[PDB]
Design a protein around this ligand. Structure first.
Ligand code: CLA
Ligand code: CLA
Ligand code: CLA
Ligand code: CLA
Ligand code: CLA
Ligand code: CLA
Ligand code: CLA
Ligand code: CLA
Ligand code: PQN
Ligand code: PQN
Ligand code: SF4
Ligand code: SF4
Ligand code: SF4
Lengths: 61, 39, 145, 144, 738, 146, 80
């Protein structure tokens, strides 16, 4: 995936951050299904600012 | 002292000040121009 | 596990009173019933409509009859102003002489409610005159019921 | 680790008896019992209320429902590193190891528990309720 | 071994954390991101037990908080006095009380609110007050508004001193825990110093100022004519003239011939016929008695010499066979938690204010007091409401302590422990006794209304049909009336014209009369007792199910305040002791409303009126219209609503306006008390779509209120609406008809 | 409720004659209240009295009955389950532990109402009381005055 | 018994297991996450629905939910 600190656009319909943009913390070089790690700056309905995603679910924008 | 100034610029104080200003203005207006309805 | 809510066997196994409550609650939710098929559902709604028709017919014929029996119609038609219509005979072993007397004054010899249901105006307007005809109409509506 | 065996003869702790006591549920459909052993002798807090003293060594108690055993389990586990386990006692006394079992508490993973009730999928990937319709009982698409 | 201990410069004086909101909680101090942040910030500003866990820290905090409260009170008092000095018709009312009505609050000649400046007499305009400061001041001896002025100035100075003391004893020289724990010293000091010397100096002021000048006023001499207090002090000749004992100084008292001082240390009983007040010599003797009693009481406990008692030793000495270890450890619990003290004290305080209201309407102590029926009613109901609230708060903080700071180990076989044991039997018993009282008492009223509207009043419950008589109360009244002949032979009269006797009237107005008791009053008293037991049941469950429950066995760790435990095991909404206090407050409101209604109707109907005999304001419709609900509604309420619903174009338009506003907000509370935050959050989200589409979404995320927040806002609004409605109605009605 | 109130007031004023009174007292809420309800209430609350009764006693009674239905359904609407559940628990302990009462034993076990069940029963009580009170008032006014 | 359902996003942080007051859960070895653990709910008949677990699980779209079902002596957790 894109190098760390890069900025992508979440697209998973269910995701509280849907159709939004967040900062990629890092990506696992290994083969876990959701190696993407995305910080945010607006906590969801439980107080979390970083979520995990697969590759496709995001767009680097 | 700057701490104190920022304490002033906190929100509720500024809200009170702006509302006091607006209300005082309206009151003085209705004093000097009693019971207007037209124009 | 008692056959309470039949259509809902799980509740039929519930040993709490919520069994009774919800078994009452979902009685007619035929979508949420056991072995519910489409033609089943349809024939059920069909019987339901029949039931509704019968109920409404009974309602109308019952008001017809109660008037035809204990009303002041055939006097009412004469003066459509100072005749208030009689609703239905009042009967109660509790009411004292004051209430009987007070309730008696308003219709005829006996306590009665004063119907405010416009049926008098309607029926007389359509051509209803005599209690005989009201009896006829009531019994015929019950036939259709 | 091996499954323990409920010894019905265990010194019950020091307690003056309270209201949360015996019901007829034990003689009707089910009831429960817990056990453990203490390092020293000490006072503690009865879950159903009242003050009780744990006896130095083994102890035995009686609870109707299960969450009470759960709660006293948690208490002893947290406050003195203690380790209890318990037993569902059926109508006809069919002892059933409710505690221990896996031999190790499920806080730490353990090879041998088979992954159960799991769906290797997300939850947005469930089907519309229009399609689950027409069953003898009402099913939620979540199960399929 | 007890002494004084202190610590220096514990906390500086700076605005640093003033610029740091939420500094007191390391949690909140990390910043806001959602709305509910603000709610929480306001909510737990004073939750000292959750701030930190140092006893000494929380202790210094509550000390300085006390000082703040004190300063505020002094401020408001000085404000009252200055208003009375500068914007009142007080001197006119001093000239004539009987026709000039007190008025101190004046309005400004603006867009139209000047119509309220009611002609209260004395060539004066404004708004009638009910507080009674006029009669109080006359009782004391204030004549010159100069005195009110200097009094207000001194009060302000005292408020400043209180604030300074708070700042000092928090930031510069803070005390220590044991010095906060020296409880025997504290009780000795309070009971002796405070109350003893208060009553003593009170007796002194009464004697040397308020007795003579009030003798003169009642003699009718011109007010400003009467000499000055310092002249009264200086010239023993004048006081000798007034009371021939004063010539002898103090030697006769010293020689133990106290009888000679009886000239102005009297035991009259009864009232003062010219003013309707109690006899000032009698109150002076009373206060002297209280003074010596409490000052002797202030010499009980040991502090630094073996003489005196040890509270803990006395406590343990009382143990019982049926009870096990008895009172052991209570000295600990009390010497260790603020919340136990707060619970006990609030309970006693509320009960005491209730007793104050009752005693005060019973035996009016001020001159010309009995006249203003409006003032009487107002004082009574106000103090009653305050008592109810204090008692509910007692219950609340009791349960709060029980959850938070109780310890099981220290109390193995305690009275406390065994109570916790048989809580189930206790609660079940209380339940049944309540439902029994409810059934009987209220079904009586419904049976009455049915026997009426059916047309058979022959079978109702009144003084006419099948009767019910407060035989016990009539007996007690009889006995207190006949007491002084034999029981207190040196008592010259009953201590209240309510025990029976003649009628004292002033200015064509009744001041008191023996009060009848009817089947009506029986039934009303029993309704009172039922609702009281019900409230007590709510709160006692709230406290005895604090730690755990047969439903939730881990209630303790979940804290004192929380919405539910989810829909689990059938739905767990409203299970916290906080919600217990919620509903208890509800029922408290209901009970107090009913009791003040009882009081108002009884007074208006069968005591009040003017002398011709007497002419009761409703002529006594009570004892026959108060035992049916329809009669209640129509003849009392729907009746007396007249002046309040026609108060327009007059200085009473405000009362009707507030009547309306109170109905409004009272209804408005119901949306909160019924809705559910999930729906609110969804609608909020759609609104956020709307805003954000214009790129105007707020940086602070919008979150619907918390569940408990919805509950609390609902209850506050509802209570406000109800009590405001009844307040406006009472004031308008009684001021119109009296 | 609003629409029916308005219709009723204007038609009362029509049948009586002082429609000017409607056009004047109908532009301010205090006029609405005092002149329309408190003014038209006088007869009903007198349907009976400590004196006797009349044809309107029953309507006054139904007025009061609806008020009670309403004020009781409020308890449903506001209080929620877990509280009553704890209650019923203590209660059942009492019922079985007191002597000579444990003899009989019910079949279906006692619990408080589910959330939705309680909400619905409360709404029912509310609406019933509401409609009863208003209907009684309206009919009493129109008939006892015309 | 009330219904339970895990999902592939079970990160195995055990907060489900760390929360349940009814031992309706346990952690098994897994592969799809780095913790190599997926929560497992093998004892549905003792869940009462208290939803402490659904309160826990930090997966963005939850991971493991509960659904309400019929009742019994065993199920509802009623002491009588
Ligand atoms: C929200 C509706 C509303 C509107 C459109 C107006 C409009 C007006 N008000 Mg205001 N007014 C309102 C509500 C409103 N008022 C309310 C709720 C209050 C009570 C707080 C008042 C109390 C009030 C007074 C006391 C006076 C006005 C006056 C006025 C005039 C102000 C310029 C104008 C006719 C003044 C005027 O001259 O009106 C003709 C005037 O005398 N208003
Ligand atoms: C469907 C509507 C309806 C309703 C609500 C009632 C209601 C009542 N009827 Mg019935 N009644 C009805 C239709 C209805 N009736 C019909 C259709 C007939 C035709 C046979 C009758 C004939 C009838 C008789 C003959 C009598 C009643 C009477 C009564 C009352 C006592 C039973 C009760 C108020 C009794 C009554 O008047 O009690 C005061 C009575 O004597 N009804
Ligand atoms: C106890 C609290 C209190 C309250 C509720 C009020 C309320 C009021 N004061 Mg203030 N006032 C108070 C204390 C208070 N005052 C104190 C302590 C002082 C002494 C500094 C004053 C001195 C004062 C003056 C001198 C005046 C007011 C006035 C007023 C009115 C408009 C401001 C208002 C009714 C004004 C007023 O009523 O004008 C007619 C006005 O002129 N007040
Ligand atoms: C303008 C004077 C002043 C200043 C600069 C401070 C400064 C401070 N006070 Mg405050 N405080 C003052 C007067 C002042 N106080 C007064 C008059 C009192 C007595 C009523 C108190 C009683 C008081 C308490 C009880 C507490 C503070 C606390 C604080 C801190 C945040 C507020 C800060 C050190 C809080 C603190 O120490 O936070 C760490 C705290 O607990 N103050
Ligand atoms: C035994 C209880 C008792 C009683 C029955 C009264 C009765 C009275 N006190 Mg109180 N009073 C008491 C104890 C009591 N006081 C104590 C212990 C103190 C000293 C702290 C005071 C200090 C006090 C003052 C300073 C005043 C009263 C006043 C009053 C009147 C207000 C009611 C009434 C005559 C007022 C009074 O006498 O007005 C004429 C008044 O101004 N009392
Ligand atoms: C508690 C307050 C108090 C104070 C400050 C004073 C102050 C005074 N009293 Mg005392 N006095 C008091 C209470 C008080 N008295 C009481 C309660 C009694 C009754 C026991 C008296 C009875 C009394 C008498 C009879 C006389 C004084 C007198 C005096 C003056 C000389 C001593 C002095 C101004 C003397 C004086 O100057 O009287 C005018 C005097 O002869 N007092
Ligand atoms: C003597 C007055 C007094 C004092 C010092 C406190 C002090 C406190 N109350 Mg309050 N409280 C009081 C009376 C008082 N209360 C009364 C009369 C009531 C009844 C309406 C309550 C009901 C009450 C509740 C229900 C709660 C507080 C809470 C609190 C705490 C945070 C605010 C704080 C310790 C809150 C808290 O955090 O409690 C732990 C809280 O939840 N109080
Ligand atoms: C709960 C309290 C209560 C009590 C103590 C009474 C007492 C009485 N009722 Mg009952 N009654 C009540 C409530 C109560 N009623 C209610 C809420 C409706 C009625 C309706 C009612 C009727 C209709 C009758 C009674 C009758 C009576 C009398 C004998 C039974 C007696 C005066 C009977 C009686 O003797 O009437 C004269 C009777 O006929 N009651
Ligand atoms: C109406 C309602 C809401 C919605 C009401 C909310 C969120 C409160 C709104 C408060 C005000 C009106 C908004 C914020 C005001 C601040 C001062 C911000 C500045 C606003 C400027 C205009 C000054 C709930 O959230 C709720 C929650 C739980 C039970 C019942 C209810 C409930 O009934
Ligand atoms: C009082 C109360 C109870 C206790 C009340 C219960 C369990 C029901 C009591 C029923 C009584 C004993 C008899 C019911 C009388 C009805 C008129 C029955 C009608 C039957 C129809 C078939 C006609 C709850 O269960 C509850 C649950 C959730 C929120 C609020 C509350 C609540 O306030
Ligand atoms: S949100 Fe309300 S209904 Fe839902 S579990 Fe919590 S208290 Fe119960
Ligand atoms: S609902 Fe959640 S917390 Fe309750 S038992 Fe089931 S998994 Fe555990
Ligand atoms: S579902 Fe959530 S709490 Fe449970 S194991 Fe997976 S990540 Fe942990």
């Amino acid at each position: 995936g894109p190098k760390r600190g890069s900025l992508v656009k979440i697209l998973r319909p269910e995701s509280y951050w849907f159709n939004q943009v967040g900062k990629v913390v890092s990506v696992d070089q290994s083969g876990v299904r959701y190696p993407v790690v995305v910080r945010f700056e607006n906590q969801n309905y439980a107080g979390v600012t970083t979520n995990n995603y697969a590759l496709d679910e995001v767009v680097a924008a | 002292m700057k701490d104190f100034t920022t304490y002033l610029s906190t929100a509720p104080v500024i809200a009170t000040i702006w509302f006091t200003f607006t209300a005082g203005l309206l009151i003085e207006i209705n004093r000097y121009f009693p019971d207007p309805l037209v124009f | 596990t008692k056959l309470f809510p039949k259509f809902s066997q799980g509740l039929a196994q519930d040993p709490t009173t919520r069994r009774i409550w919800y078994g009452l609650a979902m009685a007619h939710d035929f979508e949420s019933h056991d072995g519910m098929t489409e033609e089943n559902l349809y024939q059920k709604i069909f019987a339901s409509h029949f039931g509704q028709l019968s109920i409404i017919f009974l309602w109308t014929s019952g008001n017809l009859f109660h008037v035809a029996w204990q009303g002041n119609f055939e006097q009412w038609v004469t003066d459509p102003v100072h005749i208030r219509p009689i609703a239905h005979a009042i009967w109660d072993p509790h009411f004292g002489q004051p209430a009987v007397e007070a309730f008696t004054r308003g219709g005829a010899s006996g306590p009665v409610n004063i119907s405010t249901s416009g049926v008098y105006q309607w029926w007389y307007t359509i051509g209803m005159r005599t209690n005989q005809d009201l009896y006829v109409g009531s019994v015929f509506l019950a036939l259709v019921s | 680790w091996t499954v323990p065996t409920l010894n019905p003869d265990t010194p019950s702790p020091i307690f003056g008896g309270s209201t949360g006591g015996l019901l007829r549920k034990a003689q009707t459909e089910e009831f429960y019992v817990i056990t453990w052993e203490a390092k020293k002798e000490q006072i503690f807090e009865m879950p159903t209320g009242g003050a009780a003293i744990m006896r130095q060594g083994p102890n035995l108690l009686k609870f109707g429902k299960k969450e009470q055993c759960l709660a006293l389990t948690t208490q002893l586990r947290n406050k003195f590193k203690l380790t209890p386990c318990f037993y569902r006692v059926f109508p006809d006394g069919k002892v059933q190891y409710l505690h221990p079992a896996d031999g190790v508490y499920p806080e730490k993973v353990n090879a041998g528990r088979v992954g159960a009730n799991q769906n290797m999928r997300r939850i947005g990937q469930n089907v519309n309720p229009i399609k689950v319709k027409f069953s003898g009982r009402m099913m939620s698409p979540a199960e399929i | 071994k007890v002494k004084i201990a202190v610590d220096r410069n514990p906390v500086e004086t700076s605005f640093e954390k003033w610029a740091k909101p939420g500094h007191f909680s390391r949690t909140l101090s990390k910043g806001p991101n959602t709305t509910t942040w603000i709610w929480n910030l306001h909510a737990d500003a004073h939750d000292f037990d959750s701030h930190t866990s140092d006893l000494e820290e929380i202790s210094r905090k509550v000390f300085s908080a006390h000082f703040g409260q004190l300063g505020i009170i002094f401020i408001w008092l000085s404000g009252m006095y200055f208003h009375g000095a500068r914007f009142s018709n007080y001197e006119a009312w001093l000239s004539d009380p009987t026709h000039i009505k007190p008025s101190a609050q004046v309005v400004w000649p603006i867009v139209g609110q000047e119509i309220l400046n009611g002609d209260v007499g004395g060539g004066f305009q404004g708004i009638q007050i009910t507080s009674g400061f006029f009669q109080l001041w006359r009782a004391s001896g204030i004549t010159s508004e100069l005195q009110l002025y200097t009094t207000a100035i001194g009060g302000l100075v005292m408020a400043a001193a209180m604030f300074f003391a708070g700042w000092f004893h928090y930031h510069k020289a803070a005390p220590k825990l044991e010095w906060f724990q020296n409880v025997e010293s504290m009780l000795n000091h309070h009971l002796g110093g405070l109350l003893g010397l208060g009553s003593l100096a009170w007796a002194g002021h009464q004697i040397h100022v308020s007795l003579p000048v009030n003798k003169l006023l009642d003699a009718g001499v011109d007010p400003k004519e009467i000499p000055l207090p310092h002249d009264l002090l200086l010239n023993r000749a004048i006081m000798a003239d007034l009371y021939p004992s004063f010539a002898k100084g103090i030697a006769p008292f010293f020689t133990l011939n106290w009888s000679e001082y009886s000239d102005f240390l009297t035991f009259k009983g009864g009232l003062n016929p010219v003013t309707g007040g109690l006899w000032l010599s009698d109150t002076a003797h009373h206060h002297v008695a209280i003074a010596v009693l409490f000052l002797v009481a202030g010499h009980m406990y040991r502090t630094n010499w073996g003489i005196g008692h040890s509270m803990k030793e006395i406590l343990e000495a009382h143990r019982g066979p049926f009870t096990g270890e008895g009172h052991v450890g209570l000295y600990e619990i009390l010497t260790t938690s603020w919340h136990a003290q707060l619970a006990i004290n609030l309970a006693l305080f509320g009960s005491l204010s209730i007793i104050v209201a009752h005693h005060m309407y019973a035996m009016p102590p001020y001159p010309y007091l009995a006249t203003d029926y409006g003032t009487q009613l107002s004082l009574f109901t106000h103090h009653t409401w305050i008592g109810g609230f204090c008692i509910v708060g007692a219950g609340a903080h009791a349960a709060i302590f029980m959850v938070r700071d109780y310890d099981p180990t220290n109390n193995y076989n305690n009275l406390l422990d065994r109570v916790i044991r048989h809580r189930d039997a206790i609660i079940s018993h209380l339940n049944w006794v309540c439902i029994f009282l409810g059934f009987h008492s209220f079904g009586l009223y419904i049976h009455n209304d049915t026997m009426s509207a059916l047309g058979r009043p022959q079978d109702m419950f009144s003084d006419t049909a099948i009767q019910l008589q407060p035989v016990f109360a009539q007996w007690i009244q009889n006995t207190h009336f006949l007491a002084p002949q034999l029981t207190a032979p040196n008592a010259l009269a009953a201590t209240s014209l309510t025990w029976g006797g003649d009628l004292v009237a002033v200015g064509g107005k009744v001041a008191m009369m023996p009060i009848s008791l009817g089947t009506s009053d029986f039934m009303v008293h029993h309704i009172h007792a039922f609702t009281i037991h019900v409230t007590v049941l709510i709160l006692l469950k709230g406290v005895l199910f604090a730690r755990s429950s047969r439903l939730i066995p881990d209630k303790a760790n979940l804290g004192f305040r929380f919405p539910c435990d989810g829909p689990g095991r059938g739905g767990t909404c409203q299970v916290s002791a906080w919600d217990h206090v919620f509903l208890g407050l509800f029922w408290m409101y209901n009970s107090l409303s009913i009791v003040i209604f009882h009081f108002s109707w009884k007074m208006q109907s069968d005591v009040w009126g003017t002398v011709t005999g007497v002419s009761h304001i409703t002529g006594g419709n009570f004892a026959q219209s108060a035992n049916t609900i329809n009669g209640w509604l129509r003849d009392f309420l729907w009746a007396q609503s007249s002046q309040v619903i026609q108060s327009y174009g007059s200085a009473l338009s405000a009362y009707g306006l507030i009547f309306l506003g109170a109905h409004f907000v009272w209804a408005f509370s119901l949306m909160f008390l019924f809705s559910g935050r999930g729906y609110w959050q969804e609608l909020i989200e759609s609104i956020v779509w709307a805003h954000n589409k214009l790129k105007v979404a707020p940086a602070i995320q919008p979150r619907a209120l918390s569940i408990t927040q919805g509950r609390a806002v609902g209850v506050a609004h509802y209570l406000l609406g109800g009590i405001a409605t009844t307040w406006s109605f009472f004031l308008a009605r009684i001021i119109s008809v009296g | 409720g609003w629409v029916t109130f308005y219709w009723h007031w204007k038609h009362l004023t029509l049948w009586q004659g002082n429609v000017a009174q409607f056009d004047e007292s109908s532009t301010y809420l205090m006029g609405w209240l005092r002149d329309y309800l408190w003014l038209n209430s006088s007869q009903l609350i007198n349907g009976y009295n400590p004196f006797g009764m009349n044809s309107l006693s029953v309507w006054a009674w139904t007025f009061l009955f609806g008020h009670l239905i309403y004020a009781t359904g409020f308890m449903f609407l506001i209080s929620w389950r877990g509280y009553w559940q704890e209650l019923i628990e203590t209660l059942v302990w009492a019922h079985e532990k007191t002597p000579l009462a444990n003899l009989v034993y019910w079949k279906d076990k006692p619990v408080a109402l589910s959330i939705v069940q309680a909400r619905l029963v409360g709404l029912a009580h509310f609406s019933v009381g509401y409609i009863f009170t208003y209907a009684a008032f309206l009919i009493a006014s129109t008939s006892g005055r015309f | 018994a009330h219904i339970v359902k895990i999902y592939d996003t079970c990160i195995g942080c055990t907060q489900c297991v760390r929360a349940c007051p009814l031992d309706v859960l346990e952690m098994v070895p897994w592969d799809g996450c780095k913790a190599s653990q997926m929560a497992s709910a093998p004892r549905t008949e003792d869940c009462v629905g208290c939803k402490r677990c659904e309160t826990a699980c930090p997966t963005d779209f939850l991971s493991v939910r509960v659904y309400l079902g019929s009742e019994s002596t065993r199920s509802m957790g009623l002491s009588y």
